[PDB]
Structure formats: C-alpha cells, structure tokens
C-alpha cells in the first residue's frame, strides 16, 4: 500500500519504471487484486536411483545426528507458497539513509581501478554464453506455448538470437516484453530469452571480479581454504556475519549506484543504454506468485520497489560487488579512515596488500582486520549496516560482532576449513555437516548426474573419509562412457591443489581421526556396516555397461 | 661411402636399436639423392634453400689486450657451416673398447645411491616446466607453418599440450614424428614440441645432482670458487684437463648406459619405456645440415651414431653425470681402487668426504687428489681416457696431466678464481678476460641490457670495469621492465648477510688488474670520466636512478 518517498542520488541516472502494460498483459490477469500484502502491490490475479541408495544404511544417524533432513515437505502448497512469499519477500527495503554519497564514491572508485587496469567491459560472447547457461532451466510463463524443453533444448535450437533481439528491441524502447518474473519454490526469474539478454549484457562482470584478491569468483571450493588461511595470516581477526534474507533487502537506491557504475563499465554508448534499462526493470520487479484461497488457487501478479530476484546469472556478480562496496564502506566509516585515502583502501584490498583484507561471495563475506581494528569495528560497525536495513541474522539489531580468531572457526560459503595435509604440504580443506553434503548430492541421465556427484565429491570432499567413500562407490556403480573425467586419477587432483608437487593415492590426506565428530560422521557401528556392506551393495546396482573398481583406493 | 665400425654389446643394457625414422624423414621435403662427401655422418638426400654504446670507448682495448672481438660483426656463410662441421662433428666416435663393464657398475651405483637416498624421479610439472624453458627458443623447421613467435609464445598458447601427447605416442610407437634435428651456427635441436617432452621426461635429473657434492647444479656463480678452494684445501693438487669436442666424442655405448640408468631412476614402467625411445632417437641422430655447392644453397640430411647434440635440454645433465662416471671411473682404475670399494667412493664424493674431489658441470671438470695419488693419475690415466676417445685438447696423447697446487690456477666453467674480501671473510669469486664478460653481456633490448645490468653487478662486482659498467647500465635502463636489487642481495648470497653495505663488497688488488683484467690505464680513465655524460645522452623518456654514485 504505503510506500516511503525515494531516496535523491546526486550523480547517478534514476531507475525511472518502464511502461509495462505490454508486460503485464502477457499474464492473463482475470480478476480484480484482494490486496493482502504489506509492501507488495498487488495487481491483480488470475486461476491457476544410485546415490539415494548408495546412502540408505546411513539414512537414520543422517537424519538424527545430522542435518540430511527427510523433513522435506517434498510439494509446498500454494497456501505455504505465498506464506513464505508475505514473511521474507513482502517487507520494504530501506530507502532513506544517509549514506549513499560515501556508497557512491566508493564504487566510482572501484570502477574507476577497474577501467584503469582491465579496460571496458564487452558483451559476452556465443561461446563464453554457452558455457554459463543452466540448460536446466525453465522457459517461463510467457514462453510455454513455443514448446521447447528447457534452456539448453532452446539454445541448441538457435531461435533465442531473434528473440534476444526482439526483447532488446521493445526494452529500449521503455515498452518491454517478457518484463515480469515467474516464480517457484522463493525463486524469482524471468523467461528464457530474457535470461540469455540480461547474462549476454552483464556477463562480464564476473570477468572482473576474477582479478580481485577479495573475490573467489573462478576458483574452485579446494582453493577456499588457503585464501582464509592467508587472509588471516596477515590479520589475526575475523569478523563473518550473516546477513537474513539479504536479496529481500537491497534497495532502490542501491541498485541505481549499481546501475551507475555498471553503466561506467560499459564500451560504448548504447551498451550503456542497454544496462541501465535492465535496471530500470530490476528496481521495479513484477512477479507471479502462487496463493490458496477457500480451496482456490491463483497466480497473484504483484508489484514490488527494488530488491534482488533468484533466478538472475547477474546476480551473483551484482550482490558480490555491492558486498564489497557497502562492507568496505562501513568498516571505513566505522574506523575512520579518511575519504582520501580510500582509493588506496579498494587497491590494496583488491591486491591482498596491508593488513585488512575481505573475501565476498554473493552474500557471504569474512572482514580481516587486525585486534585493534577488529574490536573498533565489532563495537560500532553494525551502526551503518542498520541504518540500510542490512540487518544482520539471529543476531539483537545492537549486539557487537563476534571476531574470531581461530581460522578454523572461519565460515565462508556454507563451510569451514581445516588443514588437511598433502605429502609435506599442508592445504586447508571445506567442512560442512556431512548431511548436507550427502543431501545436495543425491537431490540437490540419472546414472549420469550422479557419476558428476562422485567426481564432484572426489575432488572436493576427498578429506572426509565417508565422502571419499561415497564418492568411490558412486564411480563404480555408474557406467564408462556417458577437468573431470572417467580417467579422473590423483594427479589431476593434485595439480588443482598443490601444482602437482605431490601425486598418487597416498598422497591424499584426511583429515584428524579425533574431529570425525559433529559435522562429520562418527565411525561407529552403522558406519562400519555401511562399510562393509559398500562392495556387495555396488554389484547389486550395476546393471548393463561397463564398470571399474573404485573402493579398492 | 662411410663405413661404421661394429657396435658394442654391452652386458645387461636394453640396446638402442633404432626407430623407424621414414616419418621424420619424410618431414623434411628431401628432393635429391644424397652427394655423399662426409666421412663419419651418412647423407641420405638434399633439397635447395645500450650495453654496446656504453663500452664503445674500450673498443679499441677490448680488441687488441682482450678477447673481444667485433661482436655481432659477422654471420657464416653456408659453405663455412658444412666446413664447420665436416671438421668438428663428422668424426665417428670410438664405440668399441674394453671398460663397459666397470662404466656401468658406477652409473649402477650411482643410480642405486640416488633411488636409496631421494626416491624415484618424476616427470616435471607444468610450473617446473616453465620455469626452465627458452622462451626466444626456435620452433624448428617442422613447427614454422604454425605461425608461433617463439617458444614462450608457444608455450603460453597451451597448444603444446596435445602436440607433446602427439609426439609421446608417436615415439612409443617406435616411428616418432618430429625427430629429425635442426641446426644452426653447430648447435643442433629437435622442433619445439619434441623438446618441451624431453624437457618433461628427462628435466628431473637436475634435481638429483644439486644435491651431489661433485656437482654445482642449481647454484651461482659466485658460489663455485668456494667450493674449489673447499676441495683445493682437503686435497692439496688438482688436474683440470679439457676434452676437445666432448659432444662429439660420446659413444653409442656410453649413452646405452645413460638410458640404462635413466630407465632405472624412472618412477613407472612407461616412464621407463619413454625414456629408453627417447635414447633409441638419441643414438641415432638424423639433422639437416647447410651447405654450399657451385652457388646453390643446400638443406643436406645427414645419419650419425650416438654422439650428443647441445640443444636438448637434458643434455646437461646427462653430459654431467657422463662426465663424472668416466672420470671416476679413469681415476679408481688408475689410482688401484678395488671394484668393493666403488660404492664408497661414489658415496664420499658425493658427500665431500675422504681425499678425493671432483666438481663437474657438462664437459667442464676438475679432479681434486692428494699429491700421491695426483702424481699416479698424471701419468697414465689418459690410457683410459684415450680408449674412450675422450682426447683432451691441446696436448699430445700420451703426454701427463699437469698438475695444479694453486688453488688460483684452477680453470673451471671457463673461470679462475681469487679471493675477494668481503668485511672480515674472505671469499673465491670468479675472474675471466674481460673481453669475454663484456662481449657476452653485448623493448626486450632495453629489458635484456638491463638484466645483463643486474648479473654482471651480482656476479662480478670485485672486478672493477664490471661494476662499473653494470651500475652505467642500471642508469640507463629504465624502471619497470619485464626482468631494485641492492647490497642487501648481494651480501646475502655471499656471506649469508653477516657483511653489508657497499663498502663491504670487496675488490680485487689493483696489482692484479692487468692479463685478464683491464689495466687502469689512459682509455680505461677516460671511459670513467665521459661515462656519466654517456648514461644522460643515453636515456629515453623513462624514469631512471643514477648508480655510478655508489663508487666514484
Ligand atoms: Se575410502
């Protein structure tokens, strides 16, 4: 209903909203809006086999001990759909704050380093967008009717290059089509061909974030470990906080400095054109929603004032960056370090020098200060990120931040690390409760996707030794011939870890007997029967092709 | 119409029997049927076709008192080329004589001594790889249709990933491709393909002999008068005695028993098999040669047997640990060592224990003995060595080794060495002519000068027209190339940083500054005077420090 006023960027271009009439009415609205949410407006709305196994005998202490979670209402109902959508979606960002001048000057800087050092950013390429399409992906409500299956049957079928255009075509003009998000269970995304637009024209900035020593972006989970471990070398203290339900939180305002600067980064002038665009259709998100009433179910169009949806490929690199800029923001502010030099601070930030550091993943970030900044900062820090709404999770809004320091205790990107040792090398490996691990990795072309599991798992979790068997079992259950390959042997995962200084089986470390405890399975009875059990349970599975034995390493 | 010699048949060593060399052959475009004018080398076809300036003012000494030259003044016409090498390398080495049993013993025990020490050896990474590689190196003549700068550019495409995989199986099919050599004015190579997979297969050797102690592998220059004086003092005389064209001197049967030890150091068995195909090409080299006839250029193919080319970057390390065996071998026979007692001499060698000393780095040795032993090995140990055919250079046959009993007379690796006193210690560093130094430090121009900057300064700065000239190049090269080293560097590769400053990096006497050493005299005090004035009419828009500051 009441929206606040907007916030006055000087400097930057507004998000104006586009005409989406054309959109909107390729919905099929029916009936009048009921109007039931808080910051949402509504507009109205119209009628509506190997891995699993492989686990079994663990399934109990998983699901006791360990969060495997059978508890998977499997279906949401419409009625819980929108449940979920009126708690964490419908809540109004925080636009008003006094803030955004110090915001902006700090992306102007970071895109002002970023065009110094790598040049201006291009549209990705045929080739470099076939390799980031999730050919998984869905068509979209607006899309249906053309029949194709997914994304990658859509891809291969070349159909999307008119449509791309098409889409480009009525955007620019501020009439777009295919404009409003679809939704599942709450994952926002638009059609298919605007997908393809939208990573075609912001694809690049991942290119970016692949330069800075505070982003992971192109290195894979094995290199996590020694970058924490680094980072805290030169520190000695660590602050990582959570922030609840931060794609609901940012504001308008920010995306507009995100729109700024990305429009910085353009090559020429119409590509500039193009993202700022985009962004006047993120700022000014319509979706469809799914509810239940007296037994009846809708597709709810709702219209919402700048957040961040799912089901963008942008979004990772758009919620890295502004994670970066609002982070470094405070901590400057909080510890008062001069506007002047905050060029240097982004630079030496970016190039792992002095004694602060960052690492940012979407939403996920750990702060390295030394112990006087660290107290500095745990004790008046949260001031600012309050003042945006970037509440911190399961947190008292005023409580001082915990700063750790012991790298072990380091969570970053759902996990922690440990030091597992390879020959004489010792590289600090992901841990994570092993539940999770084994629940992404039997629901999270069958025997297929579950033979990438098992080299997934060899490569990434070969420290934990259920992993390591796990993954062992799922090779020699899944057949031959359907970096990663059927010849997967140690000295590829040795090259990826240690540049191939270390080599064979042997070589492999686990990690401490002693901490096989709390997230990590517990060797006991139904362990070691899932043990031995584990080669007369990989025969009873193969059926037909041609297998290998695997437990035998 | 050369005749060859029988081979020999040496007992319990795979035999490099050669490859099926018609697709290598054929890689070369061979349009005529061979002349035939070669003594040793069979013919089997033909087809048709900054740092200078800042010297400048000791040219004229350089040329007339040192060993200078007219540095790249002049190319070699291709009839001196064939000239060069009907000369040099068309000689048949000496394959058939009677100490290839005792030979293979030692590189036996020499390699039984590496595997219980240090384990088997790998093939290198790709980091280790490339930090070892040429990167100006040339493509070869079958890689030229690729269209590559150069070996770096080569290396960076990651192209050569495939084509090295390409070449292996190839080769251990037994008909390789690319294994016919290329030559330039003679240094001899494989395309560049062939040799990053040599490089891969046979560049761990490298890693055994930095930690022999008969071995300077892995370490400066500046390091190696130390170790000379340190064996000089626990034996008290030393024979350093030149092979001529040692290369061209190793037999068929000597690199039998090379790649009989290489298979053994091998971590695998297909490890091994590469490493003994690798020798199977080896000892039975095929390269094209230039030549001159009546005008008309020729590109001539030419088959040998079993001699060692120099561009293979392994042959190094092979021609080291040869080097060492046979000389090990020359002087236990000489000097009466009994057969049981090999193991413990290769042993003490390697760990600079007991009264014998050997320091060996390619063809370039030096045996350190006790007087005694040093006047028995004097005077008959050439038989031994002269039945190899390993002759050693300027000398009759049979005439006795000199014996040297100052440390200052040792020649090795093409240097003498005198003490340097840096603070209170005093150190061995390395002096040449310095009409050598000069000449062989004589875009990536101003990066190359720059480095040559940098070494010189490292490496030379007891002679004083070195450092000079290398702190006039450090003035005039600019800040930021693609190689701010100070003292500090110096002093701890030295002295292990118990000296420092400038003032502690020491000097030869002045008395000494003659021979081999500029004399101080009128050209060398002018030069001093106009160099400054040379550095600021030299400098080009970059930013520079001025170095000469840090003497007069
Ligand atoms: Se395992």
Known sequence: PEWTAEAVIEGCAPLTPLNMTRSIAEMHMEHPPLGITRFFKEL?????????????????????????????????????????????????????????????????????????????????????????????????????????????????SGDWRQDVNTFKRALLSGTPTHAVYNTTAIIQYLPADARLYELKVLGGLHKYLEKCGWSVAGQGLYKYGDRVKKSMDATGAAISEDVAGWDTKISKGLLTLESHMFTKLAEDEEMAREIHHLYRLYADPHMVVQREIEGEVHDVLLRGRGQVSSGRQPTYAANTITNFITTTYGMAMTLGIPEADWPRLIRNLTDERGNRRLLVSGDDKVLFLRGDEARVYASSAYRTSNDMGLVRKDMALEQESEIIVDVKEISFCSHRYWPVKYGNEIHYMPVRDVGEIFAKATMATQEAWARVQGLNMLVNYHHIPECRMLALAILSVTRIGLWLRDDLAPDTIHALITEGRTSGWDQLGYVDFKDRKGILLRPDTSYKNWRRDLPGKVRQLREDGQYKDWLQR
């Open 44 to 156: 109205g709305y119209k009628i509506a086999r190997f891995v699993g196994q492989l686990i079994e005998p663990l399934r109990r202490v998983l699901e006791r001990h360990h969060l495997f979670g059978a508890w998977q209402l499997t279906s949401t109902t419409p009625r819980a759909v929108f449940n979920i959508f009126r708690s964490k979606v419908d809540r109004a960002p925080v636009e008003l704050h006094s803030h955004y001048p110090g915001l902006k000057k700090m992306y102007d800087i970071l895109a002002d380093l970023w065009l110094e050092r790598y040049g201006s950013m291009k549209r990705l390429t045929e080739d470099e967008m076939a390799s980031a399409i999730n050919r998984r992906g869905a068509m979209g409500y607006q899309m249906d009717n053309r029949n194709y299956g997914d994304l990658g049957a859509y891809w291969d």
